[PDB]
């Protein structure tokens, strides 16, 4: 359990259309992905890597005394489409994650794809918190940019505080009807068993510090302890696409283990196993999206979890969703081809 064998866990963001999943991530990243999107909607799985240094800075306003202990090296956050036509991608993102944020519009409560998401979460026993987003839409909300929720909530007028309590109670009742007990996050005395509700605004940043602290807490206090450390390689192909200068590449979620430039890799292809070597192992800059076209950073080595793009010859027939394996010293290359096909 050395700190040079720590693993960055995977957090999926799930929720109904237009609840603010991408906008929340844009506020954390300081990006404008949502503005860029056709229709303002997400149509693919996105991956952004957050080094723990950034998480520490973005939670300082709810950790002023420094007493919160950070143990993760970072977190890979997966953005997903809420639109009904992409249930396959919510399913894939859910299958990949270790923990999750379920985004609910506080003004609307639970909606059809919230219910779909809750089924995914319950089935896989995924620890999650709920972001009750768009609190700035409470009428008369007075913002302090990027504040902790409690601090800001204390400064609101009586009308706003009453409206919040009323909507919060309604949402709690909705979750209870779906079989989930939930509590406002600082009122939750059973983090292991009850869902924490953290009110947020993607527009003002309020509550995001609380939300980030909570997902680190999910990693450190709910996720299986073994997942804090790197073990055997696990990787999944997300997409296959030709990129200028690199030929047909694959975007991969590295879920566990370590990938290296030059690795002999095996994966499923249309006509049978593909066996090739990694020519370039690419990532976005930290806190930038895998689903966004850009210049890429080349790495000799990438430790899990991360979203990577791999350049290699012979990827033309790669199958999205395929597992990916690396040929190790004690492996037989053909035997490994047979194992990936399984
Ligand atoms: N006022 C306010 N508006 C918000 C907030 N969060 C998101 N929005 C707005 O809601 C709209 C939808 O946000 P978006 O980030 O696209 O949702 P999404 O959950 O990613 O939606 P999808 O990709 O599943 S279709 C956008 O216009 C965005 O500006 C918020 O906290 N306050
Ligand atoms: Cl949970
Ligand atoms: Mg989106």
Describe the structure.
- The protein is α/β, with parallel strands linked by helices and 342 residues long.
- The chain has two domains: 1-230, Rossmann fold, CATH 3.40.50.300; 231-342, Elongation Factor Tu (Ef-tu), domain 3 (Beta Barrel), CATH 2.40.30.
- Helices cover 27% and strands 27% of the residues.
- It is built from nine helices and 17 strands.
- The strands form four sheets. It has a seven-stranded mixed sheet with strand order 2-3-1-4-5-7-6, with helices on both faces. Strands 8-9-16-13-14 form a five-stranded antiparallel sheet, with no helix packed on it. A three-stranded antiparallel sheet has the order 12-11-17, with helices on one face.
- Helix 4 packs parallel to helix 5 (112-124).
- The longest helix is centred in the middle third of the chain and has 20 residues, at 158-177.
- The structure holds 5'-guanosine-diphosphate-monothiophosphate (GSP), chloride ion (CL) and magnesium ion.
**CATH class of the largest domain, anyone?**
Alpha Beta
* Strand fraction: 25-35%
CATH architectural type of the largest domain: 3-Layer(aba) Sandwich
Helical segment tally?
Answer: 9
Hetero ligands: 5'-guanosine-diphosphate-monothiophosphate, chloride ion, magnesium ion
| Largest sheet properties | 7 strands, mixed
- Quickly count the domains: 2
Classify the fold: give the CATH topology of the largest domain: Rossmann fold
Widest sheet, order of strands: 2-3-1-4-5-7-6
Ends: how far apart?
31 Å
């Amino acid at each position: 359990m050395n700190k040079d064998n720590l693993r960055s866990p995977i957090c999926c963001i799930l929720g109904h259309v237009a609840t603010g999943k991408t906008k929340l991530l844009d506020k954390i990243r300081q990006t404008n992905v949502q503005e860029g999107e056709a229709g303002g909607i997400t149509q693919q799985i996105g991956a952004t890597y957050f080094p723990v240094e950034a998480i520490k800075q973005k939670t300082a306003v709810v950790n002023k005394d420094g007493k919160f202990e950070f143990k993760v090296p970072g977190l890979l956050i997966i953005d997903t489409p809420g639109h009904e036509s992409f249930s396959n991608l919510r399913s894939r993102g859910s299958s990949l994650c270790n923990i999750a944020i379920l985004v609910v519009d506080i003004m609307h409560g639970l909606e059809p794809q919230t219910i779909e998401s809750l089924r995914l979460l319950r089935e896989r026993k995924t620890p999650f918190v709920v972001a009750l987003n768009k609190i700035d839409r409470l009428y008369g909300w007075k913002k302090i940019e990027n504040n902790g929720f409690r601090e800001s909530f204390a400064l609101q007028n009586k009308a706003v505080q009453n409206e919040f309590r009323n909507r919060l109670d309604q949402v709690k009742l909705q979750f209870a009807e779906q079989g989930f007990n939930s509590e406002l996050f600082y009122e939750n005395k059973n983090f292991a068993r009850y869902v924490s509700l953290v009110p947020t605004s993607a527009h003002t940043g309020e509550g995001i510090p609380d939300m980030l602290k909570l997902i680190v807490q999910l990693c450190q206090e709910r996720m299986a302890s073994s997942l804090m450390y790197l073990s055997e390689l696990q990787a999944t192909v997300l997409e296959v696409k030709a990129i200028e200068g690199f030929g047909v590449t694959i975007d991969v979620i590295l879920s566990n283990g370590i990938l290296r430039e030059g690795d002999r890799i095996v994966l499923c292809g249309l006509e049978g196993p593909i066996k090739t070597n990694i020519r370039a192992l690419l990532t976005p800059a930290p806190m930038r999206e895998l689903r966004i076209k850009g210049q890429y950073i080349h790495h000799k080595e990438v430790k899990a979890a991360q979203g990577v793009k791999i350049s290699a010859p012979g990827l033309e027939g790669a199958i999205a969703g395929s597992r990916l394996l690396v040929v190790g010293p004690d492996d037989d290359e053909e035997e490994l081809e047979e194992e990936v096909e399984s």
